[PDB]
């Protein structure tokens, strides 16, 4: 650590305090992450991390376990997500710097999920922009790695703003249909300009993506009234249309976010086969104005 110059205090992320730092002999900006509890079990799934490498991923560059502490190292980037659609939100983000944020982050997600590793928490804020008109998810693969509580370190609440319904419904062996999900919502979201389902609880957030979607029967998901939180007492809502959800979004893109938002995670589009989808014929890739 005393290799690291702290250069400013970006945040306080799920695991703990995020630095903007300088390596004192190398010379590289970095982001510093100080993860708090190290079990061994930890160790050998983030060095895992290290091998997933993908222009689409933020970098992870090192893993110091020093003491019983615990730091990553992550190729710094200068903005996220969050931020730009703020600085962003009395006209938007232009559609089609929407379409290569969303191309590139479901390549991104493609490479893990065939490598079998889930984000399981992505949000504005895991998302990652440069100046070259780029986009990365940061902290892949570490809720596996040190679980996913309801208040940081420092008390901040974990949104559960895009949070998949099988999560919500205690499903303990979720897959990487969870990112799709979180992904749509934050798709959703960029057209808008508004959250999808801004849920400030549990049973808000369940009932917001019910209110919108329908409540979720055997019908559209197989296997539903039989998950561990599901109440045979939920209100029954019925689906709205989805030219209702996202205006002015087209067809194909109505038709793409339909497909990332199936309550049956085995119907839920993969990463895959999205990025062969029609909404995508006509991507490319815009610079955007970034203010730092
Ligand atoms: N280079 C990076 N800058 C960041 O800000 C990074 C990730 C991040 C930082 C704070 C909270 C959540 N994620 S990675
Ligand atoms: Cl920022």
Same mark, same amino acid.
């Given at each position: 650590?005393?290799?690291?110059?702290?250069?400013?205090?970006?945040?306080?992320? =799920?695991?703990?305090?995020? @630095?903007?730092?300088?390596?004192?002999?190398?010379?590289?900006?970095?982001?510093?992450?100080?993860?708090?509890? /190290?079990?061994? =079990?930890?160790?050998?799934?983030?060095?895992?991390?290290?091998?997933?490498?993908?222009?689409?991923?933020?970098? #992870?560059?090192? $893993?110091?376990?020093?003491?019983?502490?615990?730091?990553?190292?992550?190729?710094?980037?200068?903005?996220?997500?969050?931020?730009?659609?703020?600085?962003?939100?009395? =006209?938007?983000?232009?559609?089609?710097?929407?379409?290569? @944020?969303?191309?590139?982050?479901?390549?991104?997600?493609?490479?893990?999920?065939?490598?079998?590793?889930?984000?399981?928490? #992505?949000?504005?804020?895991?998302?990652?922009?440069?100046?070259?008109?780029?986009?990365?998810?940061?902290?892949?693969?570490?809720?596996?790695?040190?679980?996913?509580?309801?208040?940081?370190? =420092?008390?901040?609440?974990? +949104? #559960?703003?895009?949070?998949?319904?099988?999560?919500?419904?205690?499903?303990? @062996?979720?897959? +990487?249909?969870?990112?799709?999900?979180?992904?749509?919502?934050?798709?959703?979201?960029?057209?808008?300009?508004?959250?999808?389902?801004?849920?400030?609880?549990?049973?808000?957030?369940?009932?917001?993506?019910?209110?919108?979607?329908? +409540?979720?029967?055997?019908? /559209?998901?197989?296997?539903? +009234?039989?998950?561990?939180? @599901?109440?045979?007492?939920?209100?029954?809502?019925?689906?709205?249309?989805?030219?209702? $959800?996202?205006?002015?979004?087209?067809?194909?893109?109505?038709?793409?976010?339909?497909?990332?938002?199936?309550?049956?995670?085995?119907?839920?589009?993969?990463?895959?086969?999205?990025?062969?989808?029609?909404?995508?014929?006509?991507?490319?890739?815009?610079?955007?104005?970034?203010? #730092?």
């Amino acid at each position: 650590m005393e290799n690291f110059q702290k250069v400013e205090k970006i945040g306080e992320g =799920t695991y703990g305090v995020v @630095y903007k730092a300088r390596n004192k002999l190398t010379g590289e900006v970095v982001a510093l992450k100080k993860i708090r509890l /190290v079990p061994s =079990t930890a160790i050998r799934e983030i060095s895992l991390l290290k091998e997933l490498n993908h222009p689409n991923i933020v970098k #992870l560059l090192d $893993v110091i376990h020093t003491e019983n502490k615990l730091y990553l190292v992550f190729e710094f980037l200068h903005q996220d997500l969050k931020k730009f659609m703020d600085a962003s939100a009395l =006209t938007g983000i232009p559609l089609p710097l929407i379409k290569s @944020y969303l191309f590139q982050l479901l390549q991104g997600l493609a490479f893990c999920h065939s490598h079998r590793v889930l984000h399981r928490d #992505l949000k504005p804020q895991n998302l990652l922009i440069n100046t070259e008109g780029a986009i990365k998810l940061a902290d892949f693969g570490l809720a596996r790695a040190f679980g996913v509580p309801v208040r940081t370190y =420092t008390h901040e609440v974990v +949104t #559960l703003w895009y949070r998949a319904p099988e999560i919500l419904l205690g499903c303990k @062996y979720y897959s +990487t249909a969870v990112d799709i999900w979180s992904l749509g919502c934050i798709f959703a979201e960029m057209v808008t300009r508004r959250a999808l389902f801004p849920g400030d609880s549990e049973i808000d957030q369940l009932f917001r993506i019910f209110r919108t979607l329908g +409540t979720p029967d055997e019908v /559209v998901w197989p296997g539903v +009234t039989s998950m561990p939180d @599901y109440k045979p007492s939920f209100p029954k809502w019925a689906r709205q249309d989805f030219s209702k $959800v996202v205006p002015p979004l087209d067809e194909d893109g109505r038709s793409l976010l339909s497909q990332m938002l199936h309550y049956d995670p085995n119907k839920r589009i993969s990463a895959k086969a999205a990025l062969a989808h029609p909404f995508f014929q006509d991507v490319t890739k815009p610079v955007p104005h970034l203010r #730092l």
